[PDB]
Design a protein around this ligand. Structure first.
Ligand code: ADP
Length: 467
C-alpha cells in the first residue's frame, strides 16, 4: 500500500506522543539503577576571542601554532593546551587531551569556568535518571569533595557508604569527604568563532582532562567490597568509563587489573539477574578493545554509534563491513548489528546515529520502538534546553520536526524486510526496530546527549516490558 510522505509524517507524530505517554507511565516501575565507574566535575568556559587572543600571544602564538599542526599526546605545557583548543577550533572537531602538568593545572583553574555541572557518563546519567526520571539511582563517585557532591540534583540519588560493617545508601551531600576535585575543563565555541586567522566551521569543544582517578578507573571501597550488597538494591545497571583503559601503564600495571574486577561485578549482576547495559564508547587501544568485546556476552544490552560499531567490526575481522558502516550505509549497519549478535549472543543492541536509531533484540514487542521514541524526544529536549530538570520539558520536544529523510528511508526497509508495524521488523529469531529521530538545529548543551539516548531507551524499555 502506497504511503505519501506527509501521511508518514503524520503517522510518526502519533507514535511519538504515544511512546511518550507510555514511557511516563512505565518509568515508575523500575525499582533501581546502578550507574558505574565514571563521575566527575565539568567546568565549562565559553571561549572569548579577545581572551584567547590575549592568551595565545602571551605564551607566544609561535609554539602555539606549531601545536596546531603537530598535536602532542597529552597536555604537558600551556602551549599544548592553547594549541589544542585552537586546533579543535580549526578542524571544528571535538577533542580531549589529558593534562599531565600540575603547572598547566594551576593555569586552568586561574583561567576559570563559566559554570559547573556533573561530569562522567555515570554522573550525567545519575542526574537524569534520578533527578529527572526520579528512578532511585545508586552511583559510583570516586572522589566526593563538597564541590562534587553539590553538583548532584535533588532526588532519589544515592551513594553507598560503609557505616560500621553496615552498608548504607545516602545522598552524595551526606557523604562528603576531604577528597580531590576531578575536573574536566570544557571549552566551547559557536558555529562561527573568531581567533587569529582561524575560523570554526562548527560549534564544538575541547576538553582538558585533569582527572587522575577516572583515568585508571579506581573503585571506591564499597564497590570493591560490598558490591553484592549494592546489587541487591537494583533492577538494572549501566556500565561505562572503560574506554580509557590502556594496555600498559608506567607503574607496571595493566588493563587486566581493572577488567578482572569488572568481570566479577558482571557475574554478581548476572547472579542476581540484573539487566545491564554497556556503553561501548570508542576504545583507541586494540588489545583493550578486543578484551571489552569478549566481555560483551556477559551484558544484556549494548549501545554504540557508527564509529564504535565499525571499530568492533575491524577487530572482529569484518574489515569490509566496517568501511561501509563508517560510510553510513544503513543496510550495512544492520548487517554489522546481526554479525555482532551472532558473535556475542547479546540480547540487545541499540545503535544510534544522526537521523535515526536502530535496536536489534532477541525478544519482540512494541516497547523497543516506543523506548527508542522516548529516547529521541529526551535527546531533543536535552539539546534544546541544554539542561533538563523536569520530565515535562521533554514534552516540548514533540514540537521538533522529525528527520524527514529518515522517514523516506523507512520505505526501503519496508521493501527489504518484514515490517509488521511501523519501525518494527520481524526476523526469524529476533526483531529489528527503526525510529526516525528529532534533530535540533543549533543545540544548547550537546555534552551528554549520547548518554541521554542510551540510558533513556534502556531504562524506559525495561519499565514498559516489566509491563
Ligand atoms: N543537535 C542534536 N539534535 C538531536 N540529536 C543529536 C544532536 N547532536 C547529537 N545528537 C545525537 O546524540 C548522539 C551523540 O552521541 P555519541 O555519538 O555517542 O557522542 P557523544 O557521547 O559525544 O554525545 C548522536 O549519535 C545523535 O544521534
Amino acid at each position: 500500500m502506497k504511503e505519501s510522505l506527509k501521511d508518514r509524517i503524520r503517522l510518526w507524530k502519533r507514535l511519538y506522543v504515544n511512546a511518550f505517554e507510555n514511557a511516563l507511565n512505565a518509568i515508575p516501575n523500575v525499582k533501581g539503577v546502578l550507574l558505574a565507574y565514571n563521575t566527575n566535575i565539568d567546568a565549562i568556559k565559553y571561549l572569548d576571542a579577545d581572551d584567547l587572543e590575549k592568551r595565545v600571544t602571551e605564551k607566544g602564538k609561535e609554539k602555539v601554532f606549531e601545536i596546531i599542526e603537530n598535536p602532542p599526546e597529552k597536555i604537558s605545557s600551556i602551549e599544548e593546551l592553547l594549541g589544542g583548543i585552537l586546533r579543535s577550533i580549526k578542524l571544528g572537531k571535538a577533542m580531549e587531551w589529558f593534562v599531565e602538568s600540575e603547572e598547566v593545572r594551576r593555569y586552568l583553574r586561574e583561567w576559570g569556568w563559566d559554570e559547573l555541572r556533573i561530569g562522567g557518563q555515570a554522573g550525567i546519567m545519575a542526574n537524569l535518571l534520578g533527578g529527572v526520571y526520579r528512578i532511585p539511582t545508586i552511583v559510583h563517585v570516586p572522589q566526593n569533595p563538597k564541590l562534587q557532591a553539590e553538583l548532584f540534583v535533588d532526588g532519589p540519588i544515592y551513594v553507598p557508604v560503609f557505616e560500621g560493617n553496615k552498608l548504607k545508601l545516602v545522598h552524595p551531600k551526606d557523604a562528603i569527604a576531604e577528597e580531590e576535585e576531578l575536573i574536566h575543563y570544557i571549552y566551547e565555541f559557536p558555529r562561527g568563532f573568531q581567533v587569529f586567522d582561524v575560523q570554526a566551521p562548527r560549534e564544538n569543544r575541547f576538553i582538558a582532562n585533569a582527572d587522575d582517578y577516572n583515568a585508571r578507573v579506581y573503585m571506591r571501597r564499597e564497590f570493591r567490597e560490598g558490591f553484592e550488597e549494592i546489587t541487591r538494591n537494583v533492577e538494572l545497571a549501566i556500565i561505562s568509563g572503560l574506554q580509557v583503559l590502556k594496555e600498559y601503564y608506567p607503574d607496571g600495571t595493566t588493563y587486566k587489573d581493572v577488567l578482572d574486577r569488572v568481570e566479577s561485578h558482571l557475574n554478581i549482576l548476572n547472579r542476581y539477574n540484573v539487566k545491564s547495559h554497556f556503553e561501548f564508547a570508542y576504545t583507541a587501544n586494540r588489545r583493550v578493545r578486543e578484551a571489552l568485546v569478549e566481555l560483551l556476552p556477559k551484558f544484556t544490552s549494548v549501545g554504540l554509534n557508527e564509529v564504535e560499531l565499525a571499530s568492533i567490526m575491524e577487530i572482529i575481522g569484518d574489515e569490509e563491513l566496517a568501511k561501509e558502516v563508517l560510510e553510513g550505509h544503513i543496510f550495512s549497519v544492520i548487517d554489522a548489528m546481526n554479525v555482532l549478535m551472532d558473535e556475542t549472543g547479546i540480547e540487545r543492541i541499540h545503535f544510534h546515529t544522526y537521523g535515526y536509531y536502530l535496536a536489534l533484540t532477541q525478544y519482540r514487542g512494541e516497547e523497543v520502538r516506543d523506548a527508542l521514541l522516548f529516547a529521541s524526544l529526551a535527546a531533543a529536549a536535552k539539546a534544546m534546553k541544554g539542561n533538563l530538570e523536569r520530565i515535562e520539558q521533554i514534552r516540548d520536544a514533540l514540537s521538533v520536526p522529525t528527520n524527514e529523510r529518515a522517514i523516506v528511508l523507512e520505505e526501503e526497509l519496508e521493501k527489504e524486510f518484514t515490517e509488521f508495524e511501523n519501525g518494527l521488523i520481524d526476523m526469524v529469531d529476533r526483531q529489528l526496530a527503526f525510529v526516525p529521530t528529532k534533530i535540533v538545529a543549533s543545540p544548547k548543551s550537546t555534552v551528554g546527549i549520547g548518554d541521554t539516548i542510551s540510558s533513556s531507551a534502556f531504562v524506559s524499555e525495561f519499565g514498559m516490558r516489566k509491563r
